[PDB]
A paper describes a structure:
To investigate enzymatic reaction mechanism, a mutant was prepared in which Mn1-coordinated His10 was replaced with Asn (H10N). As expected, the H10N mutant did not bind to Mn1. The substrate molecule UDP-2,3-diacylglucosamine was also not observed in the electron density map. However, except for the loss of Mn1, no large conformational change occurred in the vicinity of the mutated Asn10 residue, and the structure of the whole catalytic domain was similar to that of the wild type. There is no electron density for the C-terminal half of α6 and the following loop region (residues 161–169 in P212121 crystal with one Mn2+, 159–165 in P212121 crystal with no Mn2+) in the apo form, indicating they are highly mobile and disordered. In the apo form, α7 (residues 169–172) disappears and a loop (P212121 with one Mn2+) or a short 310 helix at residues 168–170 (P212121 with no Mn2+) is created. A significant structural change in residues 158–172 is important for the recognition of lipid X (and probably also the substrate); the binding site is wide open in the apo form, whereas in the EP complex, two alpha helices (α6 and α7) are formed to assemble a stable EP complex.
In the fourth step in this pathway, UDP-2,3-diacylglucosamine is hydrolyzed to 2,3-diacylglucosamine-1-phosphate (also called lipid X) and UMP. LpxH shares sequence similarity with metallophosphoesterases and requires Mn2+ ions for phosphatase activity. PaLpxH consists of two domains: a catalytic domain homologous to metallophosphoesterases (MPEs) and a helical insertion domain (HI domain) inserted in the middle of the catalytic domain.
Author numbering: 2 to 160, 170 to 241
């Protein structure tokens, strides 16, 4: 089977989420064929060169699972879009761009964090366009680490989750040639049927781990998303 998770927002001061995640790795990810993490895995990320003990311990826990043979794919979210190849190398995972189309038991399936669909938040979209400009990424990777912390504090202060724009879903799905989309970000776990030019399709939204854990599990026969307690 394959597992999909997102929006864990891992951080040292949330040891309940961490414990839930490491137990999920031991009891479920180890036995799966693949694990996909669709963004906002960490609550924030200043860059791989800023990793602390907590973040390194998470990489080491992923690496145990990858060494066991489970394929781990990590996609950026908006909170942790600076995660780099050095982190992924420690963790044994593959960085997946947003968007990516994967083959899922023979079906092409679109994966995204989801915030790119939330086009009605105009302010959010302006910030996102600045943050992902290649020139901004160039300058950020040339900023000293202490200055990146100063910027992160500034952005945190100068700033509830606006949901996806309905018409964007069929537009992007048709553009990638898929009838199944999986994303996170909106904190509204659900499966949405829809139409694409008269044809049925489906959008699956992953749950966030603030109050309970979540996982979507898929195999050739079916799929299910269900929560589980943090404690
Ligand atoms: Mn997000």
């Amino acid at each position: 089977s394959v597992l999909f998770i997102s929006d864990l927002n891992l951080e040292a001061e949330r040891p309940d989420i961490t414990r839930a995640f490491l137990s999920f790795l031991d009891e479920r990810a180890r036995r799966a064929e693949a694990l996909y993490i669709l963004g906002d895995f960490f609550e924030a990320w200043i860059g791989d060169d800023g990793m602390d003990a907590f973040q390194r311990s998470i990489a080491q826990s992923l690496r145990q699972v990858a060494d066991g043979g489970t394929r781990i794919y990590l996609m950026h979210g908006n909170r942790d879009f600076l995660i780099g190849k050095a982190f992924c190398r420690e963790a044994g995972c593959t960085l997946l761009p947003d968007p990516s189309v994967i083959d899922l038991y023979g079906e092409p399936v679109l994966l995204m964090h989801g915030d790119s669909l939330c086009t009605r938040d105009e302010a959010y979209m302006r910030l996102r366009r600045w943050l992902r400009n290649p020139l901004t990424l160039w300058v950020l990777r040339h900023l000293p680490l202490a200055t990146r912390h100063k910027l992160a504090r500034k952005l945190r202060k100068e700033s509830d989750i606006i949901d996806v724009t309905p018409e964007e879903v069929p537009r992007v799905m048709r553009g990638h040639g898929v009838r199944t989309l999986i994303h996170g970000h909106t904190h509204r776990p659900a499966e949405h049927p829809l139409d694409i030019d008269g044809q049925p399709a489906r959008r699956i939204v992953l749950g966030d781990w603030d109050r309970q854990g979540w996982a979507l599990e898929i195999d050739a026969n079916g799929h299910r998303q269900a929560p589980f307690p943090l404690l």
